[PDB]
Each structure stands twice: as C-alpha cells, then as structure tokens.
Amino acid sequence: MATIVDIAVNTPGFSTLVTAVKVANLVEALQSPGPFTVFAPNDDAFAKLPDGTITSLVQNPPQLGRILKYHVVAGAYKATDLKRMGIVTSLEGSTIPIHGDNPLEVKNATVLAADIEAENGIIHVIDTV
C-alpha cells in the first residue's frame, strides 16, 4: 500500500530506524519508485561498519538516511556509468569520487563486483565502507 520510506512518517512510533531517515531528511529521498543502486560492502567492509565509517558518515551530511535501510542510491548505475562520471551522488545528494585503475573504485573503497542487476537497480561490492 505505502512506500517503504513513506511508512516511516506513517509509523505509530516505530523504531528509531524510521526516524533516522526522517531526521536525515531522506524520507522524501528514498521515495524514488524507480531504480536502486546499492554499494554492497563485503565481509571485510562490513568490518568497517562497527563504529567506524558510518559513524563519521553520520557526522557528515544527510547520507545517514541512505545508510539505515539499504545503504542505497536511486538510479540504476552500472560501474561504467559511475566511472564515466568519476563521481557518484547519493539519494540525498552526497557526491563520492569514483576511481578505477582496473576495477571500479569508490571513495576509499575498491569494487570487487559491480554491474550487478539488483531488484530495482544495481549492486556493487566494495572492500571498504
């Protein structure tokens, strides 16, 4: 009935997870019905998560809202699109510079596998959050 994110404003006092996007102002951002590009952190990148990257990333601009649910950005981009631009923009509007010597490269991370057609867009594995 309702869009995943929309429900966050609809929730009768749900977990802070719904408010984290609401506060991050991504309640209107995640609403994108189109495609979804997820930068997927590997097991060693998931190891960057524990009070590390996302902690500084929360101190950073609205990107929190992206982090919470799917760590995703709307707009199905394959590695070739990101690198062509040399930068990537979050659903919120946060840009991250793309590199690429041989694999795709995102911020301080390296892409293990991208061009992965996700549910709505694309997934892209990085070794570093």
Side-chain angles (χ1 to χ4, degrees):
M1 178 186 62
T3 302
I4 310 96
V5 46
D6 189 83
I7 308 156
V9 188
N10 181 26
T11 44
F14 239 72
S15 306
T16 310
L17 297 176
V18 315
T19 327
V21 40
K22 267 186 291 183
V23 60
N25 88 254
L26 271 72
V27 123
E28 42 183 89
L30 314 184
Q31 300 274 325
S32 306
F36 282 95
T37 293
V38 184
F39 300 18
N42 66 30
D43 289 83
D44 190 73
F46 196 90
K48 315 296 296 180
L49 289 187
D51 189 57
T53 307
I54 257 60
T55 297
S56 180
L57 263 55
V58 71
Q59 315 272 332
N60 261 269
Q63 192 216 222
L64 164 75
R66 150 263 189 221
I67 305 168
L68 281 341
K69 292 306 196 65
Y70 307 118
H71 49 94
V72 65
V73 43
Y77 322 120
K78 297 86 230 183
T80 183
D81 183 90
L82 293 340
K83 186 175 176 295
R84 234 141 177 163
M85 295 179 57
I87 211 161
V88 288
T89 321
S90 168
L91 208 33
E92 65 107 301
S94 265
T95 12
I96 286 81
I98 295 298
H99 300 274
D101 170 84
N102 266 270
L104 188 77
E105 299 187 63
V106 32
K107 55 201 296 292
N108 53 331
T110 308
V111 178
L112 291 77
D115 181 75
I116 315 184
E117 303 190 301
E119 40 179 86
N120 296 274
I122 290 289
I123 282 155
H124 123 221
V125 182
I126 70 255
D127 91 298
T128 294
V129 173

